[PDB]
Design an enzyme around this catalytic site. Structure first.
Site, PDB file in Angstrom:
ATOM      1  N   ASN A  97    -155.853  77.296 -23.095  1.00 60.87           N
ATOM      2  CA  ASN A  97    -156.724  77.948 -22.107  1.00 60.87           C
ATOM      3  C   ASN A  97    -157.202  77.027 -20.973  1.00 60.87           C
ATOM      4  O   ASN A  97    -158.339  77.133 -20.504  1.00 60.87           O
ATOM      5  CB  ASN A  97    -157.909  78.643 -22.799  1.00 60.87           C
ATOM      6  CG  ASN A  97    -158.531  79.741 -21.944  1.00 60.87           C
ATOM      7  OD1 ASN A  97    -157.871  80.331 -21.086  1.00 60.87           O
ATOM      8  ND2 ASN A  97    -159.808  80.019 -22.181  1.00 60.87           N
TER       9      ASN A  97
ATOM     10  N   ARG B 161    -162.754  72.444 -27.503  1.00 60.94           N
ATOM     11  CA  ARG B 161    -161.567  71.795 -28.059  1.00 60.94           C
ATOM     12  C   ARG B 161    -161.894  70.522 -28.840  1.00 60.94           C
ATOM     13  O   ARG B 161    -161.037  69.988 -29.548  1.00 60.94           O
ATOM     14  CB  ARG B 161    -160.568  71.478 -26.943  1.00 60.94           C
ATOM     15  CG  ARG B 161    -160.036  72.698 -26.217  1.00 60.94           C
ATOM     16  CD  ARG B 161    -159.440  72.314 -24.876  1.00 60.94           C
ATOM     17  NE  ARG B 161    -159.228  73.476 -24.017  1.00 60.94           N
ATOM     18  CZ  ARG B 161    -160.155  74.016 -23.230  1.00 60.94           C
ATOM     19  NH1 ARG B 161    -161.381  73.510 -23.182  1.00 60.94           N
ATOM     20  NH2 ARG B 161    -159.855  75.072 -22.486  1.00 60.94           N
TER      21      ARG B 161
ATOM     22  N   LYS C 146    -147.905  77.894 -30.044  1.00 65.11           N
ATOM     23  CA  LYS C 146    -147.569  77.210 -28.793  1.00 65.11           C
ATOM     24  C   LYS C 146    -147.691  75.689 -28.884  1.00 65.11           C
ATOM     25  O   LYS C 146    -146.745  74.975 -28.544  1.00 65.11           O
ATOM     26  CB  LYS C 146    -148.408  77.765 -27.632  1.00 65.11           C
ATOM     27  CG  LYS C 146    -148.512  76.869 -26.395  1.00 65.11           C
ATOM     28  CD  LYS C 146    -147.242  76.865 -25.550  1.00 65.11           C
ATOM     29  CE  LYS C 146    -147.496  76.270 -24.167  1.00 65.11           C
ATOM     30  NZ  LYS C 146    -148.044  74.884 -24.211  1.00 65.11           N
TER      31      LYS C 146
ATOM     32  N   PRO D 277    -140.800  77.163 -26.227  1.00 68.49           N
ATOM     33  CA  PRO D 277    -142.257  77.279 -26.203  1.00 68.49           C
ATOM     34  C   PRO D 277    -142.703  78.216 -25.087  1.00 68.49           C
ATOM     35  O   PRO D 277    -142.502  77.916 -23.906  1.00 68.49           O
ATOM     36  CB  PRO D 277    -142.723  75.844 -25.924  1.00 68.49           C
ATOM     37  CG  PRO D 277    -141.569  74.984 -26.296  1.00 68.49           C
ATOM     38  CD  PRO D 277    -140.363  75.784 -25.947  1.00 68.49           C
TER      39      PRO D 277
ATOM     40  N   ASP E  19    -145.360  79.932 -22.874  1.00 69.96           N
ATOM     41  CA  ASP E  19    -146.672  80.071 -22.259  1.00 69.96           C
ATOM     42  C   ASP E  19    -146.673  81.277 -21.323  1.00 69.96           C
ATOM     43  O   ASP E  19    -145.614  81.834 -21.019  1.00 69.96           O
ATOM     44  CB  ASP E  19    -147.088  78.789 -21.522  1.00 69.96           C
ATOM     45  CG  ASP E  19    -146.047  78.303 -20.521  1.00 69.96           C
ATOM     46  OD1 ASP E  19    -144.900  78.799 -20.529  1.00 69.96           O
ATOM     47  OD2 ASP E  19    -146.382  77.404 -19.722  1.00 69.96           O
TER      48      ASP E  19
ATOM     49  N   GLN F  70    -135.956  76.246 -20.673  1.00 72.71           N
ATOM     50  CA  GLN F  70    -137.402  76.424 -20.530  1.00 72.71           C
ATOM     51  C   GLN F  70    -137.980  75.508 -19.453  1.00 72.71           C
ATOM     52  O   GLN F  70    -138.932  75.875 -18.765  1.00 72.71           O
ATOM     53  CB  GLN F  70    -138.098  76.179 -21.876  1.00 72.71           C
ATOM     54  CG  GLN F  70    -139.521  76.728 -21.984  1.00 72.71           C
ATOM     55  CD  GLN F  70    -140.587  75.705 -21.627  1.00 72.71           C
ATOM     56  OE1 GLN F  70    -140.359  74.495 -21.691  1.00 72.71           O
ATOM     57  NE2 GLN F  70    -141.767  76.191 -21.255  1.00 72.71           N
TER      58      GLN F  70
ATOM     59  N   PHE G 193    -139.437  76.783 -15.720  1.00 72.05           N
ATOM     60  CA  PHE G 193    -140.831  76.403 -15.483  1.00 72.05           C
ATOM     61  C   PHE G 193    -141.008  75.806 -14.089  1.00 72.05           C
ATOM     62  O   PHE G 193    -141.847  76.266 -13.312  1.00 72.05           O
ATOM     63  CB  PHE G 193    -141.314  75.407 -16.546  1.00 72.05           C
ATOM     64  CG  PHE G 193    -142.810  75.205 -16.568  1.00 72.05           C
ATOM     65  CD1 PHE G 193    -143.586  75.788 -17.566  1.00 72.05           C
ATOM     66  CD2 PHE G 193    -143.443  74.428 -15.597  1.00 72.05           C
ATOM     67  CE1 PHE G 193    -144.967  75.603 -17.595  1.00 72.05           C
ATOM     68  CE2 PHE G 193    -144.822  74.240 -15.618  1.00 72.05           C
ATOM     69  CZ  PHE G 193    -145.585  74.828 -16.619  1.00 72.05           C
TER      70      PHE G 193
END
Length: 289
Positions: free
Chosen positions: A126, A179, A221, A238, A240, A277, A281
DNA sequence: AGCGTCCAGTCTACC
DNA sequence: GGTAGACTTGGACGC
């Protein structure tokens, strides 16, 4: 891959470099501790070392290192042994990746440290990139060990043993927020030997996912990122929010759950899903979505 | 303006 | 079995 390697002064020179670009690699969303110098070179802190990498054509210049550290650390770190030309050719059989590849011809997947990758992507949840980079450098400055290069003091990434003696609130001082407890739980579990990072590559991909997710704050993730960027299992994708929307907009032309988007790519790309990936990205950031 | 309201994977509570 | 809403910190965007 064939390279002509030589130690020259306090630096190591590698000639015969192909399919490599510093900017594209360090800004593909995989790493956080590499920063551009005024000459276009990059300075970073990895594996308890601080080095400057510079690429001039097919010539790589790694300052502040020796021939021992190059083969022991940096060869595998920049994944120099692998042929990315064959990977790019194979993936280009899909027209979407061919277009994506032309913008990121020099992206290589770094083989980073397991512990740093784990904590780095625990911080990533996040969270926007600029903040992630800031929290990681805070953890380094606060709890790391000082090393110097060209007059400036740099800091190593704190080990689990260097984090366990602090409370959650002390960790929270790195601006990581909620976190903090995840980092505290992660450090506790590795330090106790409850989770072995050195022997983690022995297990299957699905086993590793389950082992890491036992840490509070690690889900699919984070585990996937550790698996791809640290373990080097390239048959993983992965997912996102960004890559979800990239794969949504460019392929299926619908909307999807992180699960079905992931299973679509691993099916389509196979053992090259991690590389795919990366290209999507950086292509996603280049198009602006 | 400046003050607000929204938002950038995983856990928890509750289906 | 499944997930909506909460979650630090802080930067963007509204009016």
């Amino acid at each position: 891959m064939k390279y002509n390697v030589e130690e020259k002064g306090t630096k190591v020179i590698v000639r015969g470099i192909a399919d490599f670009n510093l900017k594209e690699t360090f800004e593909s969303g995989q790493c956080f501790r590499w920063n551009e110098e005024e000459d276009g070179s990059y300075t970073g802190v990895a594996y308890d070392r601080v080095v400057n990498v510079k690429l001039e054509g097919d010539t790589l210049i790694i300052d502040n290192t020796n021939l021992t550290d190059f083969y022991d650390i940096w060869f595998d770190y920049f994944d120099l042994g692998r042929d990315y030309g064959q990977i790019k050719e194979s993936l280009s059989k899909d027209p979407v990746l061919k277009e994506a590849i032309k913008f990121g011809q020099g992206i290589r997947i770094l083989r980073q440290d397991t512990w740093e990758t784990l904590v780095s992507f625990i911080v990533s949840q996040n969270n926007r990139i600029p903040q992630i980079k800031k929290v990681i450098e805070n953890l380094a400055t606060s709890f790391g060990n000082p090393i110097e290069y060209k007059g400036k003091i740099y800091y190593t990434f704190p080990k689990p043993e260097e984090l366990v003696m602090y409370d959650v609130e002390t960790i929270a001082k790195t601006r990581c927020g909620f976190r903090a407890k995840y980092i505290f739980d992660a450090a506790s579990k590795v330090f106790s030997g409850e989770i072995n990072l050195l022997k983690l590559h022995e297990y299957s991909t699905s086993e590793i996912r389950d082992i890491l997710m036992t840490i509070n704050g690690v889900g699919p993730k984070v585990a996937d990122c550790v698996i791809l960027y640290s373990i080097g299992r390239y048959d993983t994708f992965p997912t996102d929010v960004w890559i979800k929307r990239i794969v949504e907009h460019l392929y299926l032309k619908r909307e999807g759950t992180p699960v079905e988007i992931q299973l679509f790519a691993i099916d389509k790309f196979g053992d090259l899903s991690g590389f795919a990936q990366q290209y999507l990205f950086y292509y996603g950031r280049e198009m602006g979505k």
